[PDB]
Each structure stands twice: as structure tokens, then as C-alpha cells.
């Protein structure tokens, strides 16, 4: 596995026994994303929302096939006082997915 959020965030994951990276800017977040994609790391990558909102881009450009490093737009802790607005994320997901946003 691997995550990228922040060095302060990533050292908790390294304390879990899980590979961490951390980038202050969004472009450097795609840089470290590109790094672990090219160095194909065990198939999972979590990415903070604040850096990349929908981090599908590097793997759909590079590893278009095989679906292997699973991406997750994870929530960051300074923003986890709010709690990601999980319902709004789910609405955004189904609207991205099958196009048709409705109410559950």
C-alpha cells in the first residue's frame, strides 16, 4: 500500500507499517503519485482530498489497463473536523458514475 497526504499525516501511516509520502502542492502530489505508480507498489494508493480531489488521472494515463493501484480520495485531518460531507461525496459519485443524480 501507500498513502499521500502530508508528512505529519504520512508518519502516522509509516507508524502503521504502511508506506507514506507527503506533498504540500497538488502538482507534487501528482509527482509522488506518478512515483509510486511507476514503482508499482503492492496495489493500493490513498490520496488526500485537499491535494487531488479525484486522483484517477495518473493511473488512467499510465496504467489504463489492469486496474491495479486502487485509488482512494481520502479525507484530511484539518478538514476532518468537517467530515468530508460524505453524503455530498456519494451524490457526486453516482452523478459521475451513471450520470443521473437523484435523492436517496
Amino acid at each position: 500500500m501507500a498513502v499521500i497526504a502530508d508528512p505529519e499525516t504520512a508518519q502516522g501511516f509509516r507508524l502503521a507499517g504502511l508506506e507514506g509520502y507527503g506533498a504540500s502542492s497538488a502538482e507534487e502530489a501528482q509527482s509522488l503519485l506518478e512515483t509510486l505508480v511507476e514503482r508499482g507498489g503492492y496495489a493500493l494508493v490513498a490520496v488526500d482530498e485537499a491535494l487531488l480531489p479525484d486522483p484517477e488521472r495518473a493511473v488512467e494515463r499510465l496504467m489504463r489497463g489492469r486496474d491495479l493501484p486502487v485509488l482512494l480520495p481520502i479525507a484530511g485531518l484539518k478538514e476532518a473536523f468537517q467530515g468530508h460531507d460524505v453524503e455530498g461525496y456519494m451524490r457526486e459519485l453516482v452523478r459521475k458514475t451513471i450520470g443521473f443524480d437523484i435523492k436517496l
Partner: protein, 320 residues
Amino acid sequence: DDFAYLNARVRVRRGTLLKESFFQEALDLSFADFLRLLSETVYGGELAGQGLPDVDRAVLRTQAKLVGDLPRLVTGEAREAVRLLLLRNDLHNLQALLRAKATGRPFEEVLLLPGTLREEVWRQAYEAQDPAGMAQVLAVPGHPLARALRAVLRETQDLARVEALLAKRFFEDVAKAAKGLDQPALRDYLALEVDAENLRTAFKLQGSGLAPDAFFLKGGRFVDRVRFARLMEGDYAVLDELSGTPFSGLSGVRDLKALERGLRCVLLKEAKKGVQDPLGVGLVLAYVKEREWEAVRLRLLARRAYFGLPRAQVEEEVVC
């Protein structure tokens, strides 16, 4: 040797301390107000720039400047006493060194915080064939860790059980040296720390089901080995059995967070008794523990301002 010439600079450094209102007003800041208040603080004299890591590095540099000199500027029985005050960082550096030697990462892997001996000795200890040879390279005369690791070193080459037993023998030899000094209060404070660490190992190992006698240590006065086994089992009544001792408010608790919080509270309250001894060495130990509580408060307020913590989110951190 002279427990008064150092005590004068100790009183001067005790004059350089922040009040409780310096943190109470720091309950509402935005890390720029906190940066300005730290810029007013002496610990911000090493204030490099902006950011949490710069703040923590400045705090470490300020701790090295104001606290690291206490290991120096003294020689003799007073030096042998004051060496066993800032010893947790040294044992932590030795534990990270043993972990790195047994693991295989780079010698510049851990960041190697400031302790008592030269850091060049720690760099030279990265290359040593024998563990006893590494101990002799790390051997200071009055270092208790040097005598502890050598005595624990007659088991194997390099083991993790050797490291845990070395920590146990380190606490044991620390208690032996604390009994082996002419200090009326330092032995009591060290024994309180030993019993608190025994309770901490008990709470961290509660429910593990391992052998408690292999886990329990010797050197305390506040508890019993039967009380240790009762704490190993799921019985908070043994924690309720602490009556009259310094473990007074530690009662009715099962969660280790608030448990060790109150344990640190009782330890700091016992450290507050060090102002009674203006002639020995415990006043300097009280100053060191005060700087430690200030350091925990500083990194706490730093995390609070950098991540925007609620005042309720850290309300259980400044109660004492």
C-alpha cells in the same frame, strides 16, 4: 559537585518560564498569534520561519540550549546525580540504534535527538562488530546505560528480547543508582516514576495474557506484585486500591489515555515538591520537568494551531 552554583543558574532559568496565562491566552490563536507570542517567547529565539516543523525544530533547539547545558557545567557526585534526569531521550536513542542495527536501515535513518553524550559516538557506534564493543564505544563512566547494556549483553548477539530486558535492567539499574545516592527526594521521585512505568506497562499489557512476573519490574513502593497481577487482569479495583499514595486521582479509570494523563499529572505534582529542596538537586529536576511540561504544552498548542483544534479537543491537556 557544588549543588548551589548550578542552583543559582537553575533559579535564573526558573525565572525564565512562561505562566499558565501564556497558555490560557493561547487557547485562542491562529498560529500567527501563536507565532507572535512565541516570537515574544525565549523559545522563539531559535524561531526559523513559519510552519509546524520549523516550530518543533525551534522547540528542540531551545530545549537543547536551555536544558542541554544542565548535563554539562557540573562534575562529581552532582554530575552522577544530574545525569539521571534527562535519560529518556538517551535510552530512546539507544533503542532506535539497536532497532536500526537489527533492522538494516541507514545510520542516518532515525533523527537522533539530543541527549547526554556526543552524537559522534552515536555515529561511530553504527559500525561495530560486537555488541559489547558497541557498548564500550558507548561507554561513559557515569552513564547508567553503559553499565546496563553490558550486563544485559551476556545473553546473545542482538535480540529484541535482549532490548526489552535491557530496558528492564535499565530501569532496574536506574533504581539501584537512585537508592545509591545521598538524595532524600530523588530516590522518591525515581521510585514514583518506576511504579508509574510499571502501571503503564500493566495498562499497555492489560488483556495481553502474557506472564506478568516477566513483565513486572522491581524498584517501586506504591504497588505490589500481586497488585501488579490484579492490574494485569481486568480488575480496576487495584487501581482503586491506590489510596494515600501519589496515585490518588487515578481511580475508576480503564482507558489508558486519561490513565497515563493522570499518571503524568501525579508525576508533575510530585515534581512540584522539588521546590522544597533549594540546596540539593531536586530543584533542578523540578526545573527540567517544568520545561518538559512546557514542551508538551508547546507541541500541543503547536498541533492545535496548525490543525485548528477545538478548545474541547485539548481541554484534557492543561487541567494541571
